[PDB]
Amino acid sequence: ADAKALDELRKPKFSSKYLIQHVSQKLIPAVK
């Protein structure tokens, strides 16, 4: 799927950051 539950995914809900701060340390060499 519906829309009104899917507009709520525009908000940050992660409640942990052991991936979002990890991937930027390894995305840019992998795409370069």
Place this chain on the structure above:
Amino acid sequence: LKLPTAPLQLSGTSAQIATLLWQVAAKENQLDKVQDELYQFIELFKQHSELRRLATDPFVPTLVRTKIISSVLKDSGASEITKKLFEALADEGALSALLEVTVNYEELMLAHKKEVYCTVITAEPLDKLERVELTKKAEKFVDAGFKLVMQEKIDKKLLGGFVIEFSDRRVDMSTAKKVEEFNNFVNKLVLSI
């Protein structure tokens, strides 16, 4: 084979991923783990433009898509279900489905914790006894021992009482619908008598 059954049936090909993602994370008891892991990618797709290029741009080769997702997820202690999930979507180019798997993973997680998000609209803000009256009055609308999570809003156009907005259905226990339904019943009864 022998998987735990999903809490509720769902739609096609995007919720069927999230049903299967729930059905293997329940055998691992990592239901709250990957629901946190799915949410981190949604902010990750919000940050980097070279990462959501792998889900929208149709000119990246399907080798370079499946290598970059593996070359990032070698590490960080992400769950082995999700690093098997993202390699399944990167081989098929279904990385765009993650925004729709997550909203279908949510209500599977919601019906596993048996919570239902409702919304209460009253004429005035409540007491602490009026809330425990309202909770057991509104517990007759859910179909099991569901932990009701209320939200509170105010409309003085209602002249007392409450309505519940379950986002599927609505029950109007207000006195405004009570008096207009009363007047409809009276004015239709004198239509015959």
Place this chain on the structure above:
Amino acid sequence: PAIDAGYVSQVIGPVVDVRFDGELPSILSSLEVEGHSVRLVLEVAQHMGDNTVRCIAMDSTDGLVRGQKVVDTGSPIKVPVGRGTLGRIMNVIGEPVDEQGPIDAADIWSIHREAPEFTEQSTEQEILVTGIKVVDLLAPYQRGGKIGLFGGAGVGKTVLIMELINNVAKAHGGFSVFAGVGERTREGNDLYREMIESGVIKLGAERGNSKCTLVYGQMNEPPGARARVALTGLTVAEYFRDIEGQDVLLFVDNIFRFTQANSEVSALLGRIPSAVGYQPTLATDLGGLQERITTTTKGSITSVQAVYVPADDLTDPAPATTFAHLDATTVLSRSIAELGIYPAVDPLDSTSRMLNPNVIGAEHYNVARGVQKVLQDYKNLQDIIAILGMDELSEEDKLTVARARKIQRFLSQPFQVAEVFTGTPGKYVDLADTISGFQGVLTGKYDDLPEMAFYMVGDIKEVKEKADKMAKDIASRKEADNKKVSEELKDIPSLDKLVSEIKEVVIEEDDGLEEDFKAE
């Protein structure tokens, strides 16, 4: 109740998608919906692919929710068959609809089976004398063969099927099965009451001496029921052929409604349509149904099926596919009915495999070919007779035209089942009487009679009886009007004596409608 119970996934009219959590049903297996207003039986048509089956409902799906639990019977639609089904009425799922209690079942058979194999086929061509002149002469029916009555929308292929019932079924000895597929419910009630009066269907304690089973899937039914009631009637006939081992008659009114009901369903089973708008699997559905209606070595099924033609078009694929499955074809045409010739059988479009000189004899086959030669030679003269006039043909041509107008009227016949709305008594004609009379018209023994001497008569004696009956009529002028009514003495009363006898009726004061609507 977790496994072996699936839930309704989606409902598209008569097509219900049912989702099972595991251990799906087989195709053709019947399912039951729990908590419907009537008994709703679904029959699995496809395995859609994601633990979803796709079913066709044998009743209306109005009131299905997409969560309803659907139990699987583990078997196809199984109907009662046997001798306790005789004199009863069944619907598509085998339930009684005559309010005579439960059906005493010698067996509970599935309505789906394969056709009998090649080695069980029997090649025996014996004639079936029907009493109908055009049928016995120009397209004779096989006793043990498949018979088709083609025609569309009021040409007379139900009065032909009732005359065939009245003639063949009463003088048969075996059992009959009437499978009403997609027809009027008035006609099914008429046949049931008419068969009660004739003793073909007996009620109550002497019920087992009945000679007919009715299976009714009439035109008020949803398209899942009409697409499968011919299979139920076929199964009731197949039990008598295989197990009881005897000769039966299967009258199927409008086998076209089977094709049409599959054509209604198949638009929603998600298929590319075929030609005129029909399903792609037309010929194989019709073939797999029709290849079960056969005579085998263990029994006989004489199959009389009426086939509707849409828009009076024989090139429509549902009649054109039916044409190959039939031994005797009887094509009823609308223009012959508009000429007043009833039964409106086109003699130049109806055929038989019994019209063979090694089967029916030499003089019968020769008389039939001579009648068809005269009728074809007249059909080739229709344009110049229309636009130039009758007065410009040759003498042999206008002898051919006169003999053809004689044998067109002589092929018509009063039916014993039409005597309630015509007034003429019905005329069963023997086969030898038909051959003798048509040989008489062909050789030229009867060039002297009028044309209307041949119209609606039994045989060659009744054309001469009607000739003197209609040539004493032009001499029928009697004297003095034979009154004996002028002032009859105390036999004819006055008018106020006659109004003095007629009873007063009571007129009940403005329709009384609100007093009994509030009674409920």
Place this chain on the structure above:
Amino acid sequence: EWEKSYQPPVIHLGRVLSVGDGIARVYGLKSVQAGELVCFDSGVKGMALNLQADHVGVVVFGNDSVIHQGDLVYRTGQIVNVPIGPGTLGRVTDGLGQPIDGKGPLTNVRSSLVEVKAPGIIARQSVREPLFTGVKAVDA
């Protein structure tokens, strides 16, 4: 006795996904019946035609220009019905049983379904009594 027996029935909602070509696709209505009369928030009724896995196909009894994407569709709980009874005699109604002659609401009337199965073989009898049309070409 009405007020002592008064239960505000849980109205089941549903958004409109897509309207046009005379048919709305309706998200939601997970408990709706096939052939049920649904009611849009514009006051225009509809009939739940195709119950799909992800939406409900609703044919719209009326002009579909008043339906928007995001409109709410309340189900009425019953298969498509019209008011039948002696209170319809004399009244000019539209195709859903609502009176268009402006003579007020249909009093002394009761709703019944429009999609009823015809009476079966054992429910009929033969047609005996005549119906005189008053046309002598017909009645003769």
